[PDB]
Design brief:
Chain C: Belongs to the universal ribosomal protein uS2 family. The structure is cut from a larger assembly and holds eight protein chains of seven kinds. In chain C, about 40% of the residues lie in helices and about 15% in strands. By secondary structure, chain C is of the alpha/beta class. In chain E, helix 3 crosses helix 4 and helix 4 packs across helix 5. The chains are: A little secondary structure, B alpha+beta, C alpha/beta, D little secondary structure, E mainly alpha, G mainly beta, H mainly alpha. The structure holds FE2/S2 (inorganic) cluster and magnesium ion.
């Protein structure tokens, strides 16, 4: 049809979620 | 001059006031119509009953509904609706049936120009809810032409007095579909136990089908 | 005898042509795109009745489909030109004060009317009392902004429908077009969009008024001889 | 036609 | 004689019906224009309803293939110290220049992603572009 | 008392483009004063009350 | 061979910019109220920035400036609200003047 | 919302507490119940 139409995908500019100072530490 | 006005309710309303105690005002409900499909209603409020009559009737002609009538004597199809707690069930009827309806519906129907209809009012019998519930249901009735246009098929009327003769009442203005309407062996339509109880003869009431004056 | 020919040659002839005033030459999807008409509000502000007219959301900012705007704008300009041709009263309404001065001048220039000020209760539904029993109301109301300054629909939208007055309206993505007769999905905030709208309506109205005089004059010269 | 007392605004009018 | 029931149909349907019933003696000036050139949708009042449960708006997020390249470029090299000029309709940013070169090299048959990104940076440096890695 | 003149002709069209504000004379003055303030920017007591 | 809207949108600078947070853009002062500068930068909404303390007199109508964008439209949904509240302005930080 | 009402119709209106607004404010206007809440919150 048309090449310039939007395409479905996941947000490429999405930022990671916040993490606490102790995230990932025992 | 073409419009007639009918009163539907005259109420004495009592307002408690800070300094003057209980005061008496009048709330009036009136309906207007020209007998050719154009009808409306308005509430009137005033300290005097005749000032309320003026307000309601003059206001009603600026809020007119147009009501579609089948052959200028009845409604196009059965109408069953609820407005708040007031239920109104209306049935399309043939000529000569007359207006066998709640007295207020009779009054409103003469203003609209409906000659033949059955109506049953159940639940709260509130005049205002009944009036605006009735006008809401009569203003949302689909005519035969609207049905033909929506489905792109002929609307064919079968009358027992005319035997098997098919009478086309409405044809679509646009193209005519070639695929028949699907014939569901059994329709999933909701039925009224009152209608079924009557059709079977199990509905016995000493008050139904009583002889009354021409309406 | 002579009236039927008048109404047929002057009033009924324009209604037999798809674009009698050639309003399609006034704008293009590119001209609209340069004026930022496609820019809508954030997705959180979207009205659900504006969803048909939205192309999508670019990073939570709604984009108005200018292909639809172009078709709606064609109809709105066409209607506006015909009403100006028929010598109808056109009233411009907007409460956005950034553009009050611009809109008031555009109305005066095209020979029409503007209401950019606080809208008092009953200007339309109680006009005979406010103006007089012989007051003539507008035949067309054009809303350049359909919302008031508390982000609610302008009261004149509801009251114009009550008085059976057709409405042309620019409807952004947070607006309600249900009661607007000829809605035009488009950006109502950017000065470039609003200025474009004023040029198009001003030109359409001015062109239709000049066309009415040309036809009338020709119809008279030919009538004598 | 029923004669609700007819109204006259012009009386007190300027 | 007329109707102010703005929530019952449209101004056209209310006007057309009252003209037939003889309530309105003359048609309004706009009626013939509406009839010849009607709107796409008949303006009928509707009450906007709120979505519940599994109902969601049909609007879709607008994305392009190059957006993946833009996200990586901003992460690796950050936003260019050059300022966007959104007034110029033909403005090209450093990221757009990166994306165009990235697209050119992909069409030359290269298919790896990590390799197609490193060769693009070298090409621009050869052309004199300043690419300061953020980290 | 001075009488306000007709605000429309035989065709019913109001003379002033701000008629439907109901305050055409007042809002026309605000429009004229607001317009003067704009042009200045583009360009740039005891005895009276 | 008429360009489509999808093509205009794909190749627009605003589309190519991506997210607006922490993006340097060039704005133009179009209206000034005391020490409040109204700056258009190519978006839907203008931003309002206070006149900088240093070289305040250099900022005049028409002066082009450098901005660091934060939000294209300041909107937030508050408890018990069906929609979002918008102030109808962008959020940006005025860095200085752009010169050639 | 909570038992404390927050459905204000003009909820989006921009709160503008300035000395100049008081002089252009209508003293005829009667303060809303929630108008105090905006003042009370600012004081906090
Ligand atoms: S954010 Fe706390 S464990 Fe991940
Ligand atoms: Mg807007």
């Amino acid at each position: 049809s048309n090449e310039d139409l939007p395409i479905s995908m996941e947000n490429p500019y999405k930022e990671p979620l916040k993490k606490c100072i102790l995230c990932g530490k025992h | 001059e073409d419009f007639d006005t009918r009163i539907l309710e005259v109420r004495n309303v009592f307002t408690m006031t800070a300094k003057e105690g209980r005061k008496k005002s009048i709330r009036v409900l009136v309906a207007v119509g020209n007998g050719k499909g154009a009808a409306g209603f308005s509430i009137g409020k005033a300290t005097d009953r005749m000032d309320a009559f003026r307000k309601a009737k003059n206001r009603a002609v600026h809020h007119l509904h147009y009501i579609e009538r089948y052959e200028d004597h009845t409604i196009f199809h059965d109408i069953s609706l609820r407005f708040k707690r007031t239920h109104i069930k209306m049935k399309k009827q043939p000529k000569g049936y007359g207006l066998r309806c709640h007295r207020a519906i009779i009054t409103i129907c003469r203003l609209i120009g409906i000659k033949d209809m059955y109506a049953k009012v159940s639940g709260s019998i509130n005049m205002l809810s009944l009036t605006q519930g009735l006008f809401r249901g009569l203003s949302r009735q689909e005519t035969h032409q609207q049905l033909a246009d929506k489905k792109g098929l002929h609307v064919v009327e079968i009358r027992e007095e005319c035997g098997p003769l098919p009478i086309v009442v409405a044809s679509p203005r646009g193209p005519l579909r070639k695929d028949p309407e699907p014939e569901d062996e059994v329709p999933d339509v909701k039925l009224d136990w009152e209608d079924v109880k009557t059709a079977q003869g199990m509905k016995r009431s000493v008050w139904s089908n009583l002889k009354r004056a021409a309406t | 005898e002579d009236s039927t020919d008048f109404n047929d040659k002057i009033l009924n002839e324009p209604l037999k042509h798809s674009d009698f005033f050639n309003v399609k030459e006034l704008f293009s999807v590119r001209s609209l795109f340069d004026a930022r008409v496609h820019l809508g509000h954030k997705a959180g502000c979207r009205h659900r009745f504006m969803e048909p007219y939205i192309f999508g959301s670019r990073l939570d900012h709604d984009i108005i489909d200018l292909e639809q705007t172009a078709t709606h704008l064609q109809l709105a300009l066409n209607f506006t030109a015909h009403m100006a041709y028929r010598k109808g009263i056109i009233l411009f309404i907007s409460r956005n004060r950034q553009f009050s001065y611009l809109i008031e001048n555009m109305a005066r220039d095209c020979g029409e009317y503007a209401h950019t000020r606080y809208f008092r209760g009953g200007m339309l539904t109680n006009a005979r009392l406010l103006f007089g029993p012989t007051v003539r109301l507008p035949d067309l109301i054009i809303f350049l902004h359909t919302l008031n300054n508390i982000f609610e629909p302008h009261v004149a939208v509801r009251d114009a429908a009550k008085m059976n007055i057709p409405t042309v309206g620019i409807v952004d993505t947070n607006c309600n077009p249900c009661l607007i007769t000829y809605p035009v999905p488009g950006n109502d905030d950017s000065p470039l969009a609003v200025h474009l709208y004023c040029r198009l309506f001003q030109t359409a109205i001015t062109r239709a008024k000049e066309k009415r005089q040309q036809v009338e004059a020709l119809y008279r010269l030919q009538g004598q001889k | 036609a029923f004669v609700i007392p007819k109204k006259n605004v012009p009386t007190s009018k300027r | 004689a007329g109707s102010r029931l703005e929530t019952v149909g449209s101004i056209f349907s209310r006007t057309r019906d009252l003209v037939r019933a003889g309530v309105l003696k003359e048609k309004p000036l706009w009626f013939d224009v509406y009839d010849a050139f009607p709107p796409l949708r008949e303006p009928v009042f509707q009450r906007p309803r709120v979505r519940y449960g599994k109902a969601k708006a049909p609007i879709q997020d607008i994305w392009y293939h190059e957006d993946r390249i833009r996200a990586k470029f901003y992460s690796v090299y950050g936003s260019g110290q050059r300022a966007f000029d959104l007034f110029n309709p033909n403005f090209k940013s450093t990221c757009q220049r990166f994306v165009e070169k990235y697209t050119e090299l992909q069409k030359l048959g290269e298919t790896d992603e990590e390799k197609l990104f490193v060769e693009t940076g070298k090409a621009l440096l050869a052309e004199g572009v300043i690419l300061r890695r953020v980290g | 008392p001075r009488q306000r003149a007709i605000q429309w002709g035989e065709d019913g069209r109001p003379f002033h483009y701000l008629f439907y504000t109901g305050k055409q004379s007042y809002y026309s003055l605000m429009h004229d004063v607001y317009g003067m303030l704009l042009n200045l920017e583009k360009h740039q007591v005891i005895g009276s009350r | 061979n008429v360009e489509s809207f999808a093509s205009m949108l794909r190749h627009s600078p605003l589309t190519q910019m991506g997210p607006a947070k922490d993006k340097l853009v060039i704005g133009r002062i179009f209206h000034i109220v005391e020490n409040d500068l109204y700056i258009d930068f190519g978006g839907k909404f203008h931003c309002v920035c206070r006149r900088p303390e240093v070289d305040g007199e250099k900022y005049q109508k028409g002066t082009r400036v450098r901005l660091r964008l934060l939000d294209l439209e300041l909107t937030s949904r508050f408890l018990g609200a069906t929609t979002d509240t918008t102030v109808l302005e962008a959020n940006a930080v005025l860095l200085g003047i752009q010169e050639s | 919302k909570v038992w404390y009402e927050s459905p204000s119709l003009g909820s989006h209106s921009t709160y503008k507490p300035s000395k100049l607004e008081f002089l252009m404010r209508s003293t005829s206007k009667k303060t809303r119940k929630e108008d105090h809440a905006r003042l009370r919150a600012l004081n906090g």
